[PDB]
Protein backbone atom coordinates (compact mmCIF):
# COMPACT_ATOMS: atom_id res chain seq x y z
CA UNK A 1 0.00 0.00 0.00
CA UNK A 2 2.85 2.37 0.86
CA UNK A 3 4.60 2.03 -2.50
CA UNK A 4 1.51 2.83 -4.59
CA UNK A 5 0.67 5.95 -2.59
CA UNK A 6 4.31 7.10 -2.58
CA UNK A 7 4.48 6.75 -6.37
CA UNK A 8 1.14 8.56 -6.67
CA UNK A 9 2.50 11.38 -4.50
CA UNK A 10 5.62 11.70 -6.65
CA UNK A 11 3.39 11.73 -9.73
CA UNK A 12 1.15 14.42 -8.21
CA UNK A 13 4.21 16.55 -7.43
CA UNK A 14 5.34 16.02 -11.03
CA UNK A 15 1.88 16.85 -12.42
CA UNK A 16 1.92 19.87 -10.08
CA UNK A 17 5.38 21.34 -10.87
CA UNK A 18 5.37 22.09 -14.65
CA UNK A 19 9.07 22.68 -15.18
CA UNK A 20 9.92 19.00 -15.59
CA UNK A 21 6.46 18.22 -16.91
CA UNK A 22 10.42 12.30 -16.23
CA UNK A 23 12.98 10.95 -13.72
CA UNK A 24 12.57 10.16 -10.02
CA UNK A 25 14.97 11.46 -7.34
CA UNK A 26 15.60 14.67 -9.29
CA UNK A 27 11.88 15.55 -8.98
CA UNK A 28 12.50 16.31 -5.31
CA UNK A 29 15.40 18.73 -5.88
CA UNK A 30 13.36 20.27 -8.73
CA UNK A 31 10.40 20.76 -6.37
CA UNK A 32 12.66 22.43 -3.83
CA UNK A 33 14.00 24.73 -6.56
CA UNK A 34 10.49 25.62 -7.77
CA UNK A 35 9.49 26.18 -4.14
CA UNK A 36 12.47 28.51 -3.57
CA UNK A 37 11.18 30.49 -6.59
CA UNK A 38 8.17 31.72 -4.57
CA UNK A 39 2.88 32.92 1.39
CA UNK A 40 2.16 35.87 3.67
CA UNK A 41 0.10 38.45 1.78
CA UNK A 42 -2.43 35.90 0.47
CA UNK A 43 -3.82 35.12 3.94
CA UNK A 44 -5.62 38.49 3.89
CA UNK A 45 -7.16 37.57 0.53
CA UNK A 46 -8.23 34.21 1.98
CA UNK A 47 -9.93 35.99 4.90
CA UNK A 48 -11.69 38.37 2.50
CA UNK A 49 -12.80 35.48 0.29
CA UNK A 50 -14.15 33.18 3.01
CA UNK A 51 -15.30 35.54 5.76
CA UNK A 52 -15.72 38.78 3.75
CA UNK A 53 -13.81 40.58 6.49
CA UNK A 54 -11.27 43.36 6.89
CA UNK A 55 -8.52 43.96 9.44
CA UNK A 56 -8.26 47.11 11.54
CA UNK A 57 -6.10 48.19 14.47
CA UNK A 58 -7.80 50.82 16.63
CA UNK A 59 -6.51 52.88 19.55
CA UNK A 60 -8.09 51.47 22.70
CA UNK A 61 -8.54 54.84 24.42
CA UNK A 62 -9.49 57.45 21.81
CA UNK A 63 -11.02 54.91 19.42
CA UNK A 64 -9.05 56.48 16.57
CA UNK A 65 -7.95 53.84 14.09
CA UNK A 66 -4.19 53.37 13.79
CA UNK A 67 -4.42 51.06 10.76
CA UNK A 68 -7.15 49.82 8.43
CA UNK A 69 -6.73 47.21 5.70
CA UNK A 70 -7.84 48.06 2.18
CA UNK A 71 -10.42 45.26 2.47
CA UNK A 72 -12.62 47.81 4.28
CA UNK A 73 -13.71 49.01 0.84
CA UNK A 74 -14.88 45.57 -0.42
CA UNK A 75 -16.67 44.97 2.89
CA UNK A 76 -18.35 48.32 3.62
CA UNK A 77 -18.02 50.22 0.30
CA UNK A 78 -16.05 52.77 2.32
CA UNK A 79 -12.78 54.36 1.14
CA UNK A 80 -9.62 53.70 3.12
CA UNK A 81 -9.36 57.43 3.83
CA UNK A 82 -12.85 57.49 5.36
CA UNK A 83 -11.64 55.04 8.02
CA UNK A 84 -8.00 56.10 8.47
CA UNK A 85 -7.99 59.28 10.55
CA UNK A 86 -11.22 58.81 12.52
CA UNK A 87 -12.57 56.92 15.52
CA UNK A 88 -14.58 53.71 15.44
CA UNK A 89 -17.27 55.51 17.45
CA UNK A 90 -17.91 57.56 14.30
CA UNK A 91 -17.90 54.46 12.06
CA UNK A 92 -20.52 52.59 14.13
CA UNK A 93 -24.20 52.89 14.93
CA UNK A 94 -24.84 55.48 17.67
CA UNK A 95 -26.80 52.99 19.81
CA UNK A 96 -23.66 50.84 19.53
CA UNK A 97 -21.11 53.23 21.04
CA UNK A 98 -21.67 52.11 24.65
CA UNK A 99 -20.90 48.46 23.87
CA UNK A 100 -17.82 49.70 22.00
CA UNK A 101 -16.55 51.42 25.15
CA UNK A 102 -16.99 48.15 27.03
CA UNK A 103 -15.09 46.29 24.32
CA UNK A 104 -12.31 48.89 24.02
CA UNK A 105 -11.93 49.08 27.81
CA UNK A 106 -8.79 47.92 29.59
CA UNK A 107 -3.02 42.48 28.21
CA UNK A 108 -3.28 40.07 25.29
CA UNK A 109 -6.93 39.45 26.11
CA UNK A 110 -9.30 38.56 23.30
CA UNK A 111 -12.31 40.51 22.04
CA UNK A 112 -15.46 39.35 20.25
CA UNK A 113 -18.50 41.52 19.59
CA UNK A 114 -21.16 42.43 17.03
CA UNK A 115 -21.87 45.99 15.94
CA UNK A 116 -23.62 47.97 13.20
CA UNK A 117 -21.08 49.82 11.06
CA UNK A 118 -21.68 52.52 8.47
CA UNK A 119 -21.23 51.51 4.84
CA UNK A 120 -21.01 53.38 1.55
CA UNK A 121 -27.81 56.27 6.52
CA UNK A 122 -27.27 52.53 5.97
CA UNK A 123 -25.92 50.26 8.72
CA UNK A 124 -24.60 46.72 8.29
CA UNK A 125 -24.03 44.06 10.94
CA UNK A 126 -20.33 43.29 11.44
CA UNK A 127 -18.86 40.53 13.61
CA UNK A 128 -15.51 41.62 15.07
CA UNK A 129 -12.98 39.19 16.49
CA UNK A 130 -9.55 40.23 17.68
CA UNK A 131 -7.25 40.84 20.61
CA UNK A 132 -5.64 43.63 22.60
CA UNK A 133 -2.04 44.37 21.56
CA UNK A 134 -0.22 47.28 23.19
CA UNK A 135 0.96 49.76 20.56
CA UNK A 136 -2.82 49.87 24.11
CA UNK A 137 -4.53 48.97 20.83
CA UNK A 138 -7.10 46.46 19.61
CA UNK A 139 -6.19 44.53 16.46
CA UNK A 140 -9.30 42.90 15.06
CA UNK A 141 -10.88 41.52 11.90
CA UNK A 142 -14.50 42.51 11.33
CA UNK A 143 -16.55 40.57 8.79
CA UNK A 144 -19.97 40.58 7.17
CA UNK A 145 -22.23 37.54 7.50
CA UNK A 146 -37.01 39.04 6.41
CA UNK A 147 -38.30 42.42 7.66
CA UNK A 148 -41.49 42.61 5.61
CA UNK A 149 -43.81 43.90 8.37
CA UNK A 150 -41.82 47.13 8.73
CA UNK A 151 -49.06 44.45 1.24
CA UNK A 152 -51.24 41.58 0.00
CA UNK A 153 -51.10 39.38 3.12
CA UNK A 154 -49.97 39.05 6.73
CA UNK A 155 -48.92 36.07 8.84
CA UNK A 156 -50.28 35.24 12.27
CA UNK A 157 -49.89 32.68 15.04
CA UNK A 158 -52.82 31.02 16.79
CA UNK A 159 -53.48 28.56 19.57
CA UNK A 160 -55.60 25.53 18.76
CA UNK A 161 -58.82 27.51 19.35
CA UNK A 162 -57.81 30.29 16.93
CA UNK A 163 -56.92 33.00 19.40
CA UNK A 164 -54.52 35.46 17.76
CA UNK A 165 -51.38 34.91 19.83
CA UNK A 166 -49.24 36.78 17.29
CA UNK A 167 -49.82 39.08 14.30
CA UNK A 168 -47.30 40.96 12.19
CA UNK A 169 -47.79 44.62 11.34
CA UNK A 170 -49.03 44.03 7.77
CA UNK A 171 -52.47 43.33 9.26
CA UNK A 172 -52.97 47.08 9.76
CA UNK A 173 -52.79 47.47 5.97
CA UNK A 174 -54.75 44.35 4.95
CA UNK A 175 -57.68 44.07 7.37
CA UNK A 176 -57.18 47.60 8.71
CA UNK A 177 -57.00 46.50 12.36
CA UNK A 178 -54.41 47.45 14.91
CA UNK A 179 -52.61 44.33 16.19
CA UNK A 180 -54.14 44.83 19.65
CA UNK A 181 -57.61 44.50 18.11
CA UNK A 182 -56.89 41.07 16.61
CA UNK A 183 -54.70 39.72 19.42
CA UNK A 184 -56.49 37.93 22.24
CA UNK A 185 -59.53 37.26 20.04
CA UNK A 186 -60.37 34.15 18.04
CA UNK A 187 -60.21 34.29 14.26
CA UNK A 188 -63.80 32.99 14.02
CA UNK A 189 -64.98 36.27 15.66
CA UNK A 190 -63.86 38.00 12.44
CA UNK A 191 -65.59 35.52 10.11
CA UNK A 192 -68.92 35.90 8.35
CA UNK A 193 -71.25 33.41 10.11
CA UNK A 194 -72.04 31.64 6.82
CA UNK A 195 -68.34 30.67 6.76
CA UNK A 196 -67.55 30.24 10.47
CA UNK A 197 -68.22 26.49 10.55
CA UNK A 198 -65.96 25.95 7.53
CA UNK A 199 -63.19 27.95 9.21
CA UNK A 200 -63.56 25.93 12.41
CA UNK A 201 -63.39 22.72 10.38
CA UNK A 202 -60.01 23.78 8.99
CA UNK A 203 -58.75 24.54 12.50
CA UNK A 204 -59.79 21.02 13.50
CA UNK A 205 -58.00 19.57 10.45
CA UNK A 206 -54.65 21.39 10.65
CA UNK A 207 -54.32 19.96 14.17
CA UNK A 208 -55.64 16.55 13.09
CA UNK A 209 -53.32 16.71 10.05
CA UNK A 210 -50.18 17.84 11.86
CA UNK A 211 -47.56 19.54 9.70
CA UNK A 212 -49.70 19.63 6.57
CA UNK A 213 -50.71 23.01 5.14
CA UNK A 214 -54.43 23.53 4.57
CA UNK A 215 -56.06 26.50 2.86
CA UNK A 216 -59.59 27.85 3.36
CA UNK A 217 -61.23 31.10 2.30
CA UNK A 218 -63.70 33.22 4.25
CA UNK A 219 -65.10 36.74 4.54
CA UNK A 220 -62.94 38.52 7.11
CA UNK A 221 -64.60 41.37 9.01
CA UNK A 222 -62.35 44.38 8.46
CA UNK A 223 -61.89 47.48 10.60
CA UNK A 224 -64.04 49.33 8.06
CA UNK A 225 -66.67 46.62 8.73
CA UNK A 226 -66.32 45.25 5.20
CA UNK A 227 -66.60 41.57 4.27
CA UNK A 228 -63.17 41.20 2.66
CA UNK A 229 -62.63 37.80 1.05
CA UNK A 230 -59.45 36.19 2.34
CA UNK A 231 -57.52 32.96 1.74
CA UNK A 232 -55.93 31.70 4.96
CA UNK A 233 -53.24 29.07 4.38
CA UNK A 234 -52.34 27.60 7.76
CA UNK A 235 -50.33 24.74 9.23
CA UNK A 236 -49.34 23.36 12.62
CA UNK A 237 -45.83 24.17 13.83
CA UNK A 238 -44.04 21.52 15.89
CA UNK A 239 -41.18 21.88 18.35
CA UNK A 240 -38.24 20.08 16.67
CA UNK A 241 -37.25 18.41 19.96
CA UNK A 242 -40.43 17.11 21.62
CA UNK A 243 -42.65 17.42 18.51
CA UNK A 244 -44.71 19.68 20.78
CA UNK A 245 -47.48 21.41 18.83
CA UNK A 246 -46.43 25.02 19.40
CA UNK A 247 -48.96 27.07 17.43
CA UNK A 248 -50.91 27.17 14.18
CA UNK A 249 -49.07 29.40 11.69
CA UNK A 250 -51.59 31.07 9.38
CA UNK A 251 -50.91 33.31 6.37
CA UNK A 252 -54.01 35.45 5.84
CA UNK A 253 -53.99 36.79 2.27
CA UNK A 254 -56.45 39.29 0.83
CA UNK A 255 -57.97 37.80 -2.31
Amino acid sequence: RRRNKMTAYITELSDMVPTCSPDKLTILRMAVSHMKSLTDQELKHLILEAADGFLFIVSCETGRVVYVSDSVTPVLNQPQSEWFGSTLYDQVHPDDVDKLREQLSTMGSRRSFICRMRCGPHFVVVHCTGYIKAWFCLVAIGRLQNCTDMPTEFISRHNIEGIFTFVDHRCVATVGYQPQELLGKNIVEFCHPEDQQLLRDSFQQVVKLKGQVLSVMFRFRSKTREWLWMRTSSFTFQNPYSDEIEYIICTNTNV
Binding site: L25, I47, L55, M150, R157, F166, Q180, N239, P240, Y241
Partner: protein, 300 residues
Protein backbone atom coordinates in the same frame (compact mmCIF):
# COMPACT_ATOMS: atom_id res chain seq x y z
CA UNK B 1 23.62 2.96 -1.52
CA UNK B 2 24.72 6.58 -1.19
CA UNK B 3 21.53 7.62 -3.02
CA UNK B 4 19.68 7.05 0.26
CA UNK B 5 21.77 9.73 1.98
CA UNK B 6 21.15 11.95 -1.06
CA UNK B 7 17.44 11.10 -0.95
CA UNK B 8 17.20 11.91 2.76
CA UNK B 9 19.04 15.21 2.29
CA UNK B 10 16.82 16.28 -0.60
CA UNK B 11 13.73 15.34 1.43
CA UNK B 12 15.17 17.47 4.24
CA UNK B 13 15.74 20.36 1.83
CA UNK B 14 12.15 20.04 0.56
CA UNK B 15 10.76 20.06 4.09
CA UNK B 16 12.81 23.16 4.89
CA UNK B 17 11.76 24.97 1.71
CA UNK B 18 8.10 24.62 2.67
CA UNK B 19 6.88 27.77 4.47
CA UNK B 20 6.92 26.22 7.94
CA UNK B 21 8.88 26.42 11.20
CA UNK B 22 12.25 24.74 10.79
CA UNK B 23 11.64 22.25 13.61
CA UNK B 24 8.39 20.57 12.53
CA UNK B 25 9.53 20.69 8.90
CA UNK B 26 12.95 19.20 9.67
CA UNK B 27 11.40 16.35 11.68
CA UNK B 28 8.73 14.98 9.36
CA UNK B 29 7.73 12.01 7.22
CA UNK B 30 8.57 11.58 3.54
CA UNK B 31 4.97 10.95 2.49
CA UNK B 32 4.00 13.87 4.72
CA UNK B 33 6.52 16.09 2.90
CA UNK B 34 5.02 14.97 -0.41
CA UNK B 35 1.50 15.73 0.85
CA UNK B 36 2.49 19.14 2.18
CA UNK B 37 4.33 20.21 -0.99
CA UNK B 38 1.47 19.09 -3.25
CA UNK B 39 -1.15 20.78 -1.07
CA UNK B 40 0.91 23.96 -0.71
CA UNK B 41 1.39 24.53 -4.41
CA UNK B 42 -2.16 23.46 -5.29
CA UNK B 43 -3.33 26.05 -2.76
CA UNK B 44 -0.95 28.45 -4.50
CA UNK B 45 -2.72 27.70 -7.79
CA UNK B 46 -6.08 28.45 -6.17
CA UNK B 47 -4.65 31.59 -4.55
CA UNK B 48 -3.32 32.89 -7.87
CA UNK B 49 -6.82 32.27 -9.24
CA UNK B 50 -8.29 34.26 -6.33
CA UNK B 51 -5.92 37.24 -6.17
CA UNK B 52 -5.92 37.83 -9.94
CA UNK B 53 1.35 40.86 8.99
CA UNK B 54 0.51 37.18 9.44
CA UNK B 55 0.35 37.12 13.25
CA UNK B 56 -2.15 39.99 13.20
CA UNK B 57 -4.63 38.25 10.87
CA UNK B 58 -4.05 34.84 12.46
CA UNK B 59 -4.37 35.76 16.14
CA UNK B 60 -7.27 38.19 15.53
CA UNK B 61 -9.46 35.26 14.51
CA UNK B 62 -11.91 33.17 16.54
CA UNK B 63 -11.46 30.39 13.97
CA UNK B 64 -9.22 28.85 11.35
CA UNK B 65 -9.21 29.13 7.55
CA UNK B 66 -9.63 25.93 5.55
CA UNK B 67 -9.73 25.43 1.80
CA UNK B 68 -11.01 21.97 0.89
CA UNK B 69 -11.37 20.52 -2.59
CA UNK B 70 -14.42 19.07 -4.33
CA UNK B 71 -13.21 15.56 -3.49
CA UNK B 72 -12.88 16.55 0.18
CA UNK B 73 -9.12 17.11 0.34
CA UNK B 74 -8.16 19.82 2.85
CA UNK B 75 -5.51 21.37 0.64
CA UNK B 76 -4.89 24.12 3.16
CA UNK B 77 -5.58 24.92 6.81
CA UNK B 78 -4.37 28.09 8.52
CA UNK B 79 -1.57 27.64 11.05
CA UNK B 80 -3.74 28.51 14.07
CA UNK B 81 -6.06 25.51 13.54
CA UNK B 82 -4.34 23.65 16.39
CA UNK B 83 -5.18 26.51 18.78
CA UNK B 84 -8.84 25.57 18.25
CA UNK B 85 -8.72 21.92 17.17
CA UNK B 86 -5.59 20.46 18.80
CA UNK B 87 -4.70 18.68 15.56
CA UNK B 88 -1.80 20.58 14.04
CA UNK B 89 -1.62 21.96 10.51
CA UNK B 90 0.80 19.20 9.49
CA UNK B 91 -1.43 16.40 10.82
CA UNK B 92 -4.45 17.33 8.68
CA UNK B 93 -3.21 19.13 5.55
CA UNK B 94 -3.68 16.90 2.51
CA UNK B 95 -6.12 14.50 4.20
CA UNK B 96 -9.84 14.21 3.56
CA UNK B 97 -12.30 16.35 5.49
CA UNK B 98 -14.41 13.20 5.85
CA UNK B 99 -11.61 11.40 7.72
CA UNK B 100 -11.67 14.04 10.49
CA UNK B 101 -15.34 15.11 10.63
CA UNK B 102 -18.45 13.51 12.10
CA UNK B 103 -19.93 11.01 9.60
CA UNK B 104 -23.47 12.22 10.38
CA UNK B 105 -22.46 15.55 8.81
CA UNK B 106 -20.57 14.12 5.81
CA UNK B 107 -23.51 14.39 3.41
CA UNK B 108 -24.03 17.99 4.54
CA UNK B 109 -20.33 18.63 3.93
CA UNK B 110 -20.72 16.74 0.66
CA UNK B 111 -23.70 18.97 -0.14
CA UNK B 112 -21.65 22.11 0.58
CA UNK B 113 -18.53 21.17 -1.39
CA UNK B 114 -20.53 20.90 -4.63
CA UNK B 115 -21.36 23.82 -6.92
CA UNK B 116 -24.95 30.78 -5.72
CA UNK B 117 -21.50 30.44 -4.15
CA UNK B 118 -21.98 31.41 -0.49
CA UNK B 119 -21.90 28.63 2.12
CA UNK B 120 -22.83 28.80 5.80
CA UNK B 121 -23.21 25.64 7.88
CA UNK B 122 -22.16 23.73 11.00
CA UNK B 123 -19.96 20.64 11.08
CA UNK B 124 -18.53 18.42 13.82
CA UNK B 125 -14.77 18.02 13.37
CA UNK B 126 -12.31 16.00 15.41
CA UNK B 127 -10.60 17.82 18.26
CA UNK B 128 -7.89 16.75 20.69
CA UNK B 129 -7.41 19.93 22.74
CA UNK B 130 -9.28 20.49 26.00
CA UNK B 131 -10.40 23.57 27.90
CA UNK B 132 -7.04 23.41 29.74
CA UNK B 133 -4.87 23.49 26.61
CA UNK B 134 -3.81 19.87 27.14
CA UNK B 135 -3.82 18.18 23.73
CA UNK B 136 -4.82 14.50 23.61
CA UNK B 137 -4.49 11.81 20.92
CA UNK B 138 -6.86 10.79 18.13
CA UNK B 139 -8.01 7.67 20.00
CA UNK B 140 -9.78 9.93 22.53
CA UNK B 141 -10.81 12.83 20.30
CA UNK B 142 -14.01 14.76 20.99
CA UNK B 143 -16.40 16.25 18.45
CA UNK B 144 -16.12 20.05 18.18
CA UNK B 145 -18.83 22.03 16.40
CA UNK B 146 -17.49 24.52 13.86
CA UNK B 147 -19.56 27.21 12.16
CA UNK B 148 -18.10 27.35 8.65
CA UNK B 149 -18.76 30.44 6.50
CA UNK B 150 -17.19 30.79 3.09
CA UNK B 151 -17.42 30.52 -0.67
CA UNK B 152 -17.08 27.79 -3.30
CA UNK B 153 -14.82 28.61 -6.24
CA UNK B 154 -14.20 27.17 -9.70
CA UNK B 155 -10.41 27.33 -9.88
CA UNK B 156 -8.97 25.98 -13.12
CA UNK B 157 -11.89 22.29 -10.22
CA UNK B 158 -13.83 23.45 -7.15
CA UNK B 159 -12.67 24.69 -3.76
CA UNK B 160 -14.59 25.40 -0.55
CA UNK B 161 -12.72 28.31 1.03
CA UNK B 162 -14.30 28.57 4.49
CA UNK B 163 -13.58 30.20 7.83
CA UNK B 164 -14.47 27.76 10.61
CA UNK B 165 -15.13 29.30 14.02
CA UNK B 166 -15.74 27.24 17.17
CA UNK B 167 -18.68 28.09 19.39
CA UNK B 168 -17.30 28.80 22.85
CA UNK B 169 -18.66 26.74 25.72
CA UNK B 170 -20.55 28.99 28.17
CA UNK B 171 -18.63 27.48 31.10
CA UNK B 172 -15.19 28.21 29.56
CA UNK B 173 -14.98 31.76 28.18
CA UNK B 174 -11.78 33.80 27.88
CA UNK B 175 -13.46 36.61 25.90
CA UNK B 176 -15.12 39.52 27.76
CA UNK B 177 -18.87 40.06 27.61
CA UNK B 178 -20.57 43.44 27.35
CA UNK B 179 -23.65 44.78 29.13
CA UNK B 180 -25.50 44.10 25.85
CA UNK B 181 -25.12 40.32 26.34
CA UNK B 182 -27.15 38.14 28.70
CA UNK B 183 -27.40 34.45 29.55
CA UNK B 184 -30.34 32.06 29.38
CA UNK B 185 -31.09 28.44 30.25
CA UNK B 186 -33.56 26.24 28.40
CA UNK B 187 -34.89 22.73 28.41
CA UNK B 188 -34.16 20.73 25.27
CA UNK B 189 -37.44 21.89 23.68
CA UNK B 190 -36.12 25.48 24.00
CA UNK B 191 -38.54 26.29 26.83
CA UNK B 192 -37.14 28.88 29.23
CA UNK B 193 -35.85 27.56 32.55
CA UNK B 194 -33.55 30.47 33.50
CA UNK B 195 -32.34 33.75 32.05
CA UNK B 196 -30.17 36.62 33.24
CA UNK B 197 -31.15 39.78 35.10
CA UNK B 198 -29.78 41.85 32.19
CA UNK B 199 -32.87 40.89 30.16
CA UNK B 200 -34.82 43.37 32.29
CA UNK B 201 -32.68 46.36 31.32
CA UNK B 202 -32.21 45.00 27.78
CA UNK B 203 -35.58 43.56 26.69
CA UNK B 204 -37.88 44.54 29.58
CA UNK B 205 -38.75 41.00 30.66
CA UNK B 206 -38.60 40.21 34.35
CA UNK B 207 -36.24 37.19 34.44
CA UNK B 208 -38.71 35.19 36.55
CA UNK B 209 -41.82 35.59 34.37
CA UNK B 210 -40.13 34.02 31.33
CA UNK B 211 -39.60 30.71 33.15
CA UNK B 212 -41.49 27.78 31.66
CA UNK B 213 -42.37 29.75 28.52
CA UNK B 214 -41.59 28.34 25.08
CA UNK B 215 -39.06 30.56 23.31
CA UNK B 216 -41.03 29.89 20.10
CA UNK B 217 -43.65 32.36 21.38
CA UNK B 218 -41.16 35.20 21.94
CA UNK B 219 -39.48 35.72 18.55
CA UNK B 220 -40.87 37.47 15.50
CA UNK B 221 -42.36 34.85 13.19
CA UNK B 222 -40.55 36.24 10.13
CA UNK B 223 -37.36 34.61 11.48
CA UNK B 224 -38.85 31.15 12.13
CA UNK B 225 -37.01 29.47 9.23
CA UNK B 226 -33.74 30.33 10.95
CA UNK B 227 -34.85 29.58 14.52
CA UNK B 228 -36.21 26.10 13.75
CA UNK B 229 -33.05 25.16 11.86
CA UNK B 230 -30.88 26.49 14.69
CA UNK B 231 -32.84 24.44 17.23
CA UNK B 232 -32.62 21.41 14.94
CA UNK B 233 -28.88 21.93 14.56
CA UNK B 234 -28.66 22.54 18.31
CA UNK B 235 -30.32 19.14 18.76
CA UNK B 236 -28.22 17.27 16.18
CA UNK B 237 -24.79 18.77 16.86
CA UNK B 238 -25.06 20.00 20.46
CA UNK B 239 -24.09 23.53 19.40
CA UNK B 240 -25.34 26.24 17.06
CA UNK B 241 -25.18 29.98 16.42
CA UNK B 242 -28.50 31.52 15.46
CA UNK B 243 -28.79 34.10 12.73
CA UNK B 244 -29.82 37.66 13.59
CA UNK B 245 -33.44 37.43 14.72
CA UNK B 246 -36.04 39.51 16.55
CA UNK B 247 -37.19 38.70 20.07
CA UNK B 248 -40.47 40.44 20.88
CA UNK B 249 -39.84 42.97 23.64
CA UNK B 250 -41.80 43.31 26.87
CA UNK B 251 -44.11 46.28 26.19
CA UNK B 252 -44.20 46.06 22.40
CA UNK B 253 -41.59 45.97 19.67
CA UNK B 254 -38.61 43.66 19.35
CA UNK B 255 -34.88 43.59 19.99
CA UNK B 256 -32.28 42.11 17.65
CA UNK B 257 -30.47 39.03 18.99
CA UNK B 258 -27.75 36.62 17.97
CA UNK B 259 -27.43 33.75 20.44
CA UNK B 260 -25.06 30.77 20.66
CA UNK B 261 -26.90 27.71 21.93
CA UNK B 262 -24.95 24.80 23.41
CA UNK B 263 -26.44 21.60 24.79
CA UNK B 264 -24.85 20.82 28.15
CA UNK B 265 -24.80 17.49 29.96
CA UNK B 266 -24.94 16.48 33.61
CA UNK B 267 -21.50 14.85 34.10
CA UNK B 268 -22.80 12.18 36.50
CA UNK B 269 -25.25 10.53 34.07
CA UNK B 270 -23.94 12.00 30.78
CA UNK B 271 -27.46 12.75 29.54
CA UNK B 272 -28.57 16.03 27.91
CA UNK B 273 -29.29 18.33 30.85
CA UNK B 274 -30.22 21.67 29.26
CA UNK B 275 -29.22 24.26 26.64
CA UNK B 276 -27.20 27.35 27.57
CA UNK B 277 -27.69 30.40 25.35
CA UNK B 278 -25.36 33.41 25.34
CA UNK B 279 -27.57 36.07 23.75
CA UNK B 280 -25.99 39.16 22.18
CA UNK B 281 -28.52 42.00 22.07
CA UNK B 282 -27.74 43.73 18.77
CA UNK B 283 -30.06 46.75 19.05
CA UNK B 284 -32.49 48.66 21.22
CA UNK B 285 -36.24 48.02 21.14
CA UNK B 286 -37.46 48.58 17.58
CA UNK B 287 -41.11 49.32 16.72
CA UNK B 288 -41.98 49.53 20.42
CA UNK B 289 -45.27 51.16 19.38
CA UNK B 290 -46.22 47.97 17.49
CA UNK B 291 -47.18 45.03 19.67
CA UNK B 292 -47.10 41.64 17.99
CA UNK B 293 -48.03 38.94 20.52
CA UNK B 294 -50.49 38.63 23.39
CA UNK B 295 -47.56 38.79 25.83
CA UNK B 296 -47.18 42.43 24.76
CA UNK B 297 -50.89 43.32 24.65
CA UNK B 298 -51.60 41.87 28.10
CA UNK B 299 -48.57 43.93 29.18
CA UNK B 300 -50.69 47.08 28.73
Amino acid sequence: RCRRSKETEVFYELAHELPLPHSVSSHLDKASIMRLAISFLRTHKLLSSVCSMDNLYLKALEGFIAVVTQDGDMIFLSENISKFMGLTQVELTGHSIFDFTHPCDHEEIRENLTLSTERDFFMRMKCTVTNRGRTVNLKSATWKVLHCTGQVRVYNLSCLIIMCEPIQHPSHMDIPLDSKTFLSRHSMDMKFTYCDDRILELIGYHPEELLGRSAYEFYHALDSENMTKSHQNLCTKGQVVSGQYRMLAKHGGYVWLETQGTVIYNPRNLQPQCIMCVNYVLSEIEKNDVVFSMDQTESL
